[PDB]
Amino acid sequence: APVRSLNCTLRDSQQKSLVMSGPYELKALHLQGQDMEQQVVFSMSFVQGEESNDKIPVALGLKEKNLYLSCVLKDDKPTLQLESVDPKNYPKKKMEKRFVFNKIEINNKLEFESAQFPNWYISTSQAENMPVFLGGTKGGQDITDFTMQFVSS
């Protein structure tokens, strides 16, 4: 593993956290109180790719399980979904676009663009209790920005 993983949680610009409501499904909602234990933890991994000044290609893989987020088409329409990869070959310094997310920085906020489908980032619904998905709507009404936070052990 000539790479470097990084434990970290993800919160939207509204302060809501992401929770694994199902096996291959995540939900963004107001999490607080002891129910806080329902917070997920992704392990980012700085991989190789088009390195720029703000674009930092990485890979989000659940720390607990080997499920890596991936952007796949669902009827000619891009979408976000979890896919179990190889616990032996991953994490690796090289990753397919599906698992590569260009972490961009804009106004102290983060933006993950699907290395596979540019212009499509990870967005959430301001609505309460709503599955996370891939959307092609910069700002506007959908929340595409995010906020990562390093965690310790």
PDB file of C-alpha atoms in Angstrom:
ATOM      1  CA  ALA A   1       0.000   0.000   0.000  1.00  0.00           C
ATOM      2  CA  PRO A   2       2.365   2.715  -1.279  1.00  0.00           C
ATOM      3  CA  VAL A   3      -0.502   5.110  -0.634  1.00  0.00           C
ATOM      4  CA  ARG A   4      -1.952   7.038   2.290  1.00  0.00           C
ATOM      5  CA  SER A   5      -5.484   6.498   3.536  1.00  0.00           C
ATOM      6  CA  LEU A   6      -7.248   9.110   5.627  1.00  0.00           C
ATOM      7  CA  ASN A   7     -10.137   8.650   8.020  1.00  0.00           C
ATOM      8  CA  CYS A   8     -12.684  11.454   7.818  1.00  0.00           C
ATOM      9  CA  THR A   9     -16.424  12.109   8.047  1.00  0.00           C
ATOM     10  CA  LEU A  10     -18.483  14.199   5.612  1.00  0.00           C
ATOM     11  CA  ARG A  11     -20.935  16.968   6.458  1.00  0.00           C
ATOM     12  CA  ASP A  12     -22.981  19.130   4.081  1.00  0.00           C
ATOM     13  CA  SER A  13     -22.988  22.942   4.156  1.00  0.00           C
ATOM     14  CA  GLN A  14     -26.115  22.633   6.334  1.00  0.00           C
ATOM     15  CA  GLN A  15     -24.207  20.776   9.102  1.00  0.00           C
ATOM     16  CA  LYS A  16     -26.045  17.494   8.424  1.00  0.00           C
ATOM     17  CA  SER A  17     -24.067  14.241   8.421  1.00  0.00           C
ATOM     18  CA  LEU A  18     -24.264  11.136   6.229  1.00  0.00           C
ATOM     19  CA  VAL A  19     -25.632   7.871   7.690  1.00  0.00           C
ATOM     20  CA  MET A  20     -25.767   4.363   6.190  1.00  0.00           C
ATOM     21  CA  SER A  21     -29.521   3.693   6.261  1.00  0.00           C
ATOM     22  CA  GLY A  22     -29.112   0.630   4.037  1.00  0.00           C
ATOM     23  CA  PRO A  23     -26.412  -1.704   2.709  1.00  0.00           C
ATOM     24  CA  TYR A  24     -25.723   0.257  -0.478  1.00  0.00           C
ATOM     25  CA  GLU A  25     -27.585   3.437   0.519  1.00  0.00           C
ATOM     26  CA  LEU A  26     -26.580   6.553   2.507  1.00  0.00           C
ATOM     27  CA  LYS A  27     -28.799   9.372   3.841  1.00  0.00           C
ATOM     28  CA  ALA A  28     -28.044  12.972   4.837  1.00  0.00           C
ATOM     29  CA  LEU A  29     -30.033  14.304   7.802  1.00  0.00           C
ATOM     30  CA  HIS A  30     -29.810  16.191  11.110  1.00  0.00           C
ATOM     31  CA  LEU A  31     -27.890  13.839  13.419  1.00  0.00           C
ATOM     32  CA  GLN A  32     -27.450  14.692  17.112  1.00  0.00           C
ATOM     33  CA  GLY A  33     -27.682  13.215  20.613  1.00  0.00           C
ATOM     34  CA  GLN A  34     -26.497   9.680  21.368  1.00  0.00           C
ATOM     35  CA  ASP A  35     -27.936   8.837  17.956  1.00  0.00           C
ATOM     36  CA  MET A  36     -24.682  10.457  16.851  1.00  0.00           C
ATOM     37  CA  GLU A  37     -23.187   6.957  16.774  1.00  0.00           C
ATOM     38  CA  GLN A  38     -25.087   6.542  13.506  1.00  0.00           C
ATOM     39  CA  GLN A  39     -22.459   8.636  11.780  1.00  0.00           C
ATOM     40  CA  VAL A  40     -20.498   6.963   8.990  1.00  0.00           C
ATOM     41  CA  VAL A  41     -16.736   7.287   8.457  1.00  0.00           C
ATOM     42  CA  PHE A  42     -15.096   7.269   5.021  1.00  0.00           C
ATOM     43  CA  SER A  43     -11.400   6.568   4.457  1.00  0.00           C
ATOM     44  CA  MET A  44     -10.068   8.929   1.790  1.00  0.00           C
ATOM     45  CA  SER A  45      -7.019   7.805  -0.164  1.00  0.00           C
ATOM     46  CA  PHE A  46      -4.898  10.225  -2.185  1.00  0.00           C
ATOM     47  CA  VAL A  47      -4.554   8.356  -5.496  1.00  0.00           C
ATOM     48  CA  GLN A  48      -2.859   9.239  -8.780  1.00  0.00           C
ATOM     49  CA  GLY A  49      -4.581  11.257 -11.504  1.00  0.00           C
ATOM     50  CA  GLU A  50      -4.797  14.698 -13.091  1.00  0.00           C
ATOM     51  CA  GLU A  51      -3.079  16.594 -10.264  1.00  0.00           C
ATOM     52  CA  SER A  52      -3.781  20.335 -10.480  1.00  0.00           C
ATOM     53  CA  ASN A  53      -3.834  23.283  -8.084  1.00  0.00           C
ATOM     54  CA  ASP A  54      -7.272  22.501  -6.615  1.00  0.00           C
ATOM     55  CA  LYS A  55      -8.238  19.164  -8.200  1.00  0.00           C
ATOM     56  CA  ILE A  56      -6.980  16.410  -5.874  1.00  0.00           C
ATOM     57  CA  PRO A  57      -8.105  12.959  -7.188  1.00  0.00           C
ATOM     58  CA  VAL A  58      -8.821  10.681  -4.217  1.00  0.00           C
ATOM     59  CA  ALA A  59     -10.946   7.649  -3.331  1.00  0.00           C
ATOM     60  CA  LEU A  60     -13.681   7.450  -0.682  1.00  0.00           C
ATOM     61  CA  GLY A  61     -13.799   3.949   0.838  1.00  0.00           C
ATOM     62  CA  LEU A  62     -15.789   3.089   3.961  1.00  0.00           C
ATOM     63  CA  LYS A  63     -13.238   2.423   6.691  1.00  0.00           C
ATOM     64  CA  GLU A  64     -15.220  -0.444   8.220  1.00  0.00           C
ATOM     65  CA  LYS A  65     -16.075  -2.252   4.944  1.00  0.00           C
ATOM     66  CA  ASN A  66     -14.439  -2.391   1.500  1.00  0.00           C
ATOM     67  CA  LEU A  67     -17.303  -0.514  -0.176  1.00  0.00           C
ATOM     68  CA  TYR A  68     -16.033   2.250  -2.469  1.00  0.00           C
ATOM     69  CA  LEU A  69     -18.380   4.945  -3.763  1.00  0.00           C
ATOM     70  CA  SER A  70     -18.689   4.815  -7.557  1.00  0.00           C
ATOM     71  CA  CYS A  71     -20.365   6.861 -10.274  1.00  0.00           C
ATOM     72  CA  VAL A  72     -22.276   4.654 -12.716  1.00  0.00           C
ATOM     73  CA  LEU A  73     -24.913   5.358 -15.347  1.00  0.00           C
ATOM     74  CA  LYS A  74     -28.436   4.221 -14.541  1.00  0.00           C
ATOM     75  CA  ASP A  75     -30.393   4.480 -17.805  1.00  0.00           C
ATOM     76  CA  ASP A  76     -28.031   6.957 -19.486  1.00  0.00           C
ATOM     77  CA  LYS A  77     -28.315   9.058 -16.297  1.00  0.00           C
ATOM     78  CA  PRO A  78     -25.241   9.430 -13.949  1.00  0.00           C
ATOM     79  CA  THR A  79     -25.868   8.401 -10.326  1.00  0.00           C
ATOM     80  CA  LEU A  80     -24.049   7.625  -7.058  1.00  0.00           C
ATOM     81  CA  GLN A  81     -23.826   4.065  -5.712  1.00  0.00           C
ATOM     82  CA  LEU A  82     -21.660   1.903  -3.450  1.00  0.00           C
ATOM     83  CA  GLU A  83     -19.776  -1.064  -4.935  1.00  0.00           C
ATOM     84  CA  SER A  84     -17.744  -3.732  -3.131  1.00  0.00           C
ATOM     85  CA  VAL A  85     -14.249  -3.748  -4.646  1.00  0.00           C
ATOM     86  CA  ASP A  86     -11.322  -6.140  -4.138  1.00  0.00           C
ATOM     87  CA  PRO A  87     -10.115  -6.027  -0.463  1.00  0.00           C
ATOM     88  CA  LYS A  88      -6.787  -7.272  -1.866  1.00  0.00           C
ATOM     89  CA  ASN A  89      -6.071  -4.885  -4.755  1.00  0.00           C
ATOM     90  CA  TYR A  90      -7.644  -1.844  -3.068  1.00  0.00           C
ATOM     91  CA  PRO A  91      -6.757   0.653  -1.847  1.00  0.00           C
ATOM     92  CA  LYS A  92      -4.223   1.284  -4.642  1.00  0.00           C
ATOM     93  CA  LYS A  93      -2.289   4.293  -5.975  1.00  0.00           C
ATOM     94  CA  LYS A  94      -4.282   3.975  -9.216  1.00  0.00           C
ATOM     95  CA  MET A  95      -8.071   3.920  -9.383  1.00  0.00           C
ATOM     96  CA  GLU A  96     -10.713   3.909 -12.122  1.00  0.00           C
ATOM     97  CA  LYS A  97     -12.574   7.171 -12.753  1.00  0.00           C
ATOM     98  CA  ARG A  98     -15.636   5.662 -11.083  1.00  0.00           C
ATOM     99  CA  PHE A  99     -13.782   5.582  -7.759  1.00  0.00           C
ATOM    100  CA  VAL A 100     -11.736   8.738  -8.443  1.00  0.00           C
ATOM    101  CA  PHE A 101     -13.351  11.937  -7.138  1.00  0.00           C
ATOM    102  CA  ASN A 102     -11.686  15.278  -7.870  1.00  0.00           C
ATOM    103  CA  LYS A 103     -11.785  17.059  -4.514  1.00  0.00           C
ATOM    104  CA  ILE A 104     -12.035  20.767  -5.370  1.00  0.00           C
ATOM    105  CA  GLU A 105     -11.992  23.720  -2.947  1.00  0.00           C
ATOM    106  CA  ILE A 106     -14.348  26.692  -3.416  1.00  0.00           C
ATOM    107  CA  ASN A 107     -14.918  29.321  -0.724  1.00  0.00           C
ATOM    108  CA  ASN A 108     -13.623  27.109   2.110  1.00  0.00           C
ATOM    109  CA  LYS A 109     -15.999  24.376   0.838  1.00  0.00           C
ATOM    110  CA  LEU A 110     -15.339  21.027  -0.874  1.00  0.00           C
ATOM    111  CA  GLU A 111     -16.719  19.721  -4.174  1.00  0.00           C
ATOM    112  CA  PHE A 112     -16.409  16.126  -5.405  1.00  0.00           C
ATOM    113  CA  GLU A 113     -16.718  15.792  -9.201  1.00  0.00           C
ATOM    114  CA  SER A 114     -17.191  12.347 -10.757  1.00  0.00           C
ATOM    115  CA  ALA A 115     -13.848  11.837 -12.512  1.00  0.00           C
ATOM    116  CA  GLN A 116     -15.947   9.828 -14.975  1.00  0.00           C
ATOM    117  CA  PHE A 117     -18.717  12.338 -15.699  1.00  0.00           C
ATOM    118  CA  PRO A 118     -17.303  15.891 -15.308  1.00  0.00           C
ATOM    119  CA  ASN A 119     -19.857  18.600 -14.337  1.00  0.00           C
ATOM    120  CA  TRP A 120     -21.618  15.979 -12.184  1.00  0.00           C
ATOM    121  CA  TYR A 121     -20.861  16.207  -8.456  1.00  0.00           C
ATOM    122  CA  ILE A 122     -22.163  14.639  -5.291  1.00  0.00           C
ATOM    123  CA  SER A 123     -25.304  16.448  -4.112  1.00  0.00           C
ATOM    124  CA  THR A 124     -27.875  16.127  -1.340  1.00  0.00           C
ATOM    125  CA  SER A 125     -31.474  17.249  -0.908  1.00  0.00           C
ATOM    126  CA  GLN A 126     -32.101  19.986   1.642  1.00  0.00           C
ATOM    127  CA  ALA A 127     -35.171  17.883   2.371  1.00  0.00           C
ATOM    128  CA  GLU A 128     -35.021  15.751   5.513  1.00  0.00           C
ATOM    129  CA  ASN A 129     -34.143  12.051   5.278  1.00  0.00           C
ATOM    130  CA  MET A 130     -33.131  11.825   1.603  1.00  0.00           C
ATOM    131  CA  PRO A 131     -30.649   9.386  -0.121  1.00  0.00           C
ATOM    132  CA  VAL A 132     -27.399  10.904  -1.415  1.00  0.00           C
ATOM    133  CA  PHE A 133     -27.029  10.964  -5.205  1.00  0.00           C
ATOM    134  CA  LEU A 134     -25.132  12.308  -8.162  1.00  0.00           C
ATOM    135  CA  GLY A 135     -26.583  15.504  -9.612  1.00  0.00           C
ATOM    136  CA  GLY A 136     -25.690  17.881 -12.439  1.00  0.00           C
ATOM    137  CA  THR A 137     -26.808  21.045 -10.689  1.00  0.00           C
ATOM    138  CA  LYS A 138     -24.056  23.363  -9.453  1.00  0.00           C
ATOM    139  CA  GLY A 139     -25.326  25.183  -6.357  1.00  0.00           C
ATOM    140  CA  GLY A 140     -28.796  26.406  -7.300  1.00  0.00           C
ATOM    141  CA  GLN A 141     -31.238  24.477  -5.103  1.00  0.00           C
ATOM    142  CA  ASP A 142     -29.241  21.256  -4.714  1.00  0.00           C
ATOM    143  CA  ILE A 143     -26.400  21.198  -2.174  1.00  0.00           C
ATOM    144  CA  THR A 144     -23.280  20.151  -4.108  1.00  0.00           C
ATOM    145  CA  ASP A 145     -20.757  21.652  -1.688  1.00  0.00           C
ATOM    146  CA  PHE A 146     -19.537  19.699   1.332  1.00  0.00           C
ATOM    147  CA  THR A 147     -17.230  19.810   4.329  1.00  0.00           C
ATOM    148  CA  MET A 148     -14.761  17.125   5.342  1.00  0.00           C
ATOM    149  CA  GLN A 149     -13.368  16.739   8.846  1.00  0.00           C
ATOM    150  CA  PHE A 150     -10.268  14.765   9.872  1.00  0.00           C
ATOM    151  CA  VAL A 151     -10.922  12.190  12.638  1.00  0.00           C
ATOM    152  CA  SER A 152      -8.522  10.637  15.173  1.00  0.00           C
ATOM    153  CA  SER A 153      -8.204   7.262  16.909  1.00  0.00           C
TER     154      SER A 153
END
